[PDB]
């Protein structure tokens, strides 16, 4: 956790509905966006911290 994996995400056609409907995640908490209506929304780049 003190050396969390950092990933750059860009240049994709990324579907997030499959992640929401997977139901294998105990917690899915989103701030600034909604779990739904996010497929048609996009930004310049994505940062992933694991």
């Amino acid at each position: 956790v003190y050396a969390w994996n950092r990933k750059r995400i860009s240049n994709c056609v990324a579907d997030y509905s499959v992640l929401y409907n997977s139901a294998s995640f105990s917690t899915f908490k989103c701030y600034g966006v909604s779990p739904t209506k996010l497929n048609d929304l996009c930004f310049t780049n994505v940062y992933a911290d694991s």
Binding site: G32, V33, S34, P35, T36, K37, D40, L41
Partner: protein
């Protein structure tokens, strides 16, 4: 006459500029908030904007 015309124009311009204020919300434009937020949070932001 120039002074009263300028006063009216300044009031209109001030209203137009004030239309682009966040008012404590995440964004100053309503379309982005509507397209980004779920109905409850979007409702709160619209309340603040109104």
């Amino acid at each position: 006459l120039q002074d009263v015309v300028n006063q009216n124009a300044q009031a209109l311009n001030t209203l137009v500029k004030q239309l682009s204020s966040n008012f404590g919300a995440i964004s100053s434009v309503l379309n982005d908030i509507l397209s980004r937020l779920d109905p409850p949070e979007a409702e709160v932001q619209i309340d603040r904007l109104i």
